[PDB]
């Protein structure tokens, strides 16, 4: 009928201040990785935040907008040219070509 006390510990007594054996290399100077979040829904809203997060201009010259699909979630590059190449390989069935004219992004149909 008495009062149940607080919980009590118990175990192995591992030691806290433990050095490891693998020298994990923490980078100091991290660049910007062009990638595809699930938040930005369509292709236009993803390229509006690649141009904003890199100080470039977006010239979206398509009459309609496409949503993001499965194979878009594999682009992870610190280079804008290699990310625009991997993007245009995905949206090749709809005639979408994305290229960089050295200061801005161009979204035009394929010739």
């Amino acid at each position: 009928c008495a009062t149940k006390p607080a919980p009590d510990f118990g175990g192995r007594w591992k030691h806290v201040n433990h050095f490891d054996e693998a020298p994990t290399e923490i980078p100091l100077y991290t660049s910007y990785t062009y990638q595809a979040t699930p938040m930005d829904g369509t292709l236009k809203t993803m390229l509006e935040r690649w141009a904003a997060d890199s100080n470039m201009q977006l010239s979206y010259n398509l009459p309609s907008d496409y949503t993001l699909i499965g194979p878009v979630s594999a682009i992870s590059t610190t280079s804008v040219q290699q990310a625009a190449t991997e993007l245009s390989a995905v949206y090749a069935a709809q005639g979408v070509s994305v290229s960089v004219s050295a200061n801005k992004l161009l979204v035009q149909p394929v010739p």
Binding site: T3, K4, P5, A6, P7
Partner: protein, 33 residues
């Protein structure tokens, strides 16, 4: 004499409590500008 003793209720020393604030507190004269 033993009917004059009140009952107790204990709350142990680890239990997660919670507090409902019931009036506004203004921190604007503290935070850096």
């Amino acid at each position: 004499k033993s009917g004059r003793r009140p009952a107790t209720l204990t709350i142990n020393q680890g239990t997660v409590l919670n507090v409902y604030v019931a009036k506004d507190v203004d921190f604007s004269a503290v935070l850096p500008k």
